[PDB]
Amino acid sequence: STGSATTTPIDSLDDAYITPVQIGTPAQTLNLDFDTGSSDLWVFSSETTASEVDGQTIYTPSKSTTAKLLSGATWSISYGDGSSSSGDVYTDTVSVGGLTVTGQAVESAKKVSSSFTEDSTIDGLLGLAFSTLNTVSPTQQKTFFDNAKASLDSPVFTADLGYHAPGTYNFGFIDTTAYTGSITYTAVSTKQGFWEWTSTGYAVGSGTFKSTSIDGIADTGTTLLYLPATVVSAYWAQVSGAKSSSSVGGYVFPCSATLPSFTFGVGSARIVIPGDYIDFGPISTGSSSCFGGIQSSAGIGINIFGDVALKAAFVVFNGATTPTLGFASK
């Protein structure tokens, strides 16, 4: 089997991407944030504290003839940006782009933090990291990809995120028309539950390539590119007037600037992030100070190849017995 679904930026800055997901019988369609940095499929629901729902589409398990309460199971998760959610668990039928999993754990939110409430466009998350990170207790549950894997034509999914435009998540096949040149594959460590890999270095604009190992995660659920402070300083030094602002919470730059590109290494191959991808617009409405898309990972504890990086590539998440990651230009 295979599946194919379009993923759509939630706003004009590509702050996140939503993908429609069919849950239950009859289908209840929710727009979920596909997140290769976590491993829980959780949704806004009829159980969510009413004051914490503000415009989201909810899952109502009592209206699904295939929903079954997973007795005694609870979940609770906290993300790197400080947001959180928690609740109980149903199993139900879940389909993405034509690909169907029966008995998928659908984690029903009883509580969500303010950032989730305030984002009316995201109805929940669909985790695509390794199932070892799944938070359901006392019986850990598998991701949608993990459940679908054996049935897929090939045990892979691909992320093809757009810049200020829709893109595609495919399951079970590699669309050879979706990228240019060849796909370069690189080793993955699953030791922390992530799609963790080592970039071979970077370049700023038309500058020379710096060969240096950068360990980080491929994370579709993180907006920006978080890299070591040395790397980030070298980038923003090429932008007149750019500075790190503790009050804003990262590097800002004059909105009048033309940003240089940023290149990262995948083995001997090179992925180029156009400068425009690194612009996240005014820090507040009407400001001439703009927020940067490349930020320091210092104090995160891990480097993150978030959407800023991934949307510059066609990315293969290979879930073979020994997982790997593939990157192609497009």
Side-chain angles (χ1 to χ4, degrees), residues 1-62 64-67 69-109 112-141 143-148 150-190 192-242 244-330:
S1 62
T2 63
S4 184
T6 297
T7 191
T8 300
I10 63 161
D11 61 23
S12 66
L13 300 178
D14 298 345
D15 280 316
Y17 297 77
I18 49 172
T19 309
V21 176
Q22 283 70 50
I23 307 174
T25 312
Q28 302 181 35
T29 299
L30 275 66
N31 297 327
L32 305 189
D33 185 351
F34 282 24
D35 181 10
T36 62
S38 69
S39 308
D40 287 51
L41 194 175
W42 75 260
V43 297
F44 278 79
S45 77
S46 55
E47 305 182 320
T48 309
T49 302
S51 62
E52 297 178 351
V53 186
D54 186 10
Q56 295 82 8
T57 294
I58 59 164
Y59 170 61
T60 304
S62 69
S64 174
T65 59
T66 41
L69 177 73
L70 185 63
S71 181
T74 59
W75 63 279
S76 180
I77 191 161
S78 307
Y79 299 101
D81 68 355
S83 67
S84 62
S85 53
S86 64
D88 51 22
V89 189
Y90 295 80
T91 58
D92 209 341
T93 305
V94 173
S95 301
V96 176
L99 170 67
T100 300
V101 168
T102 55
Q104 176 64 44
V106 176
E107 298 171 38
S108 169
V112 302
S113 65
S114 55
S115 60
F116 284 115
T117 300
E118 293 162 359
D119 189 357
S120 68
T121 71
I122 292 177
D123 301 326
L125 268 63
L126 187 149
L128 294 166
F130 291 87
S131 293
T132 55
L133 297 179
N134 175 268
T135 76
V136 177
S137 177
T139 308
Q140 186 174 62
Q141 301 294 303
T143 69
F144 172 83
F145 178 52
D146 218 336
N147 281 324
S151 302
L152 296 177
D153 290 359
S154 182
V156 307
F157 68 89
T158 64
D160 181 8
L161 305 177
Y163 167 66
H164 293 176
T168 305
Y169 281 101
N170 290 328
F171 292 85
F173 73 106
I174 291 164
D175 180 357
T176 58
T177 70
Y179 59 87
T180 64
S182 51
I183 306 178
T184 298
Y185 289 86
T186 195
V188 165
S189 174
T190 64
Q192 293 189 87
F194 300 123
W195 293 92
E196 187 173 2
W197 64 290
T198 302
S199 170
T200 49
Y202 70 98
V204 178
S206 64
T208 58
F209 186 86
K210 174 74 167 178
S211 299
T212 186
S213 297
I214 306 170
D215 180 297
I217 65 168
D219 186 1
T220 60
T222 290
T223 315
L224 305 184
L225 174 52
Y226 293 89
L227 294 169
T230 48
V231 180
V232 177
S233 186
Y235 178 81
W236 287 111
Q238 297 306 307
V239 180
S240 298
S244 182
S245 170
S246 42
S247 56
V248 175
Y251 280 89
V252 299
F253 68 95
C255 292
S256 62
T258 295
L259 298 177
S261 64
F262 184 91
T263 301
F264 62 93
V266 182
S268 53
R270 307 287 178 254
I271 299 294
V272 180
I273 306 168
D276 318 38
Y277 290 26
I278 299 162
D279 178 12
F280 278 74
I283 61 173
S284 294
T285 306
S287 181
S288 70
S289 179
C290 275
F291 199 66
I294 295 176
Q295 296 295 344
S296 180
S297 65
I300 291 177
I302 195 158
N303 300 306
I304 309 174
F305 295 86
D307 300 333
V308 166
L310 302 183
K311 77 177 82 172
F314 178 87
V315 188
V316 180
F317 294 80
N318 170 24
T321 306
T322 295
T324 64
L325 273 172
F327 293 82
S329 294
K330 67 189 184 188

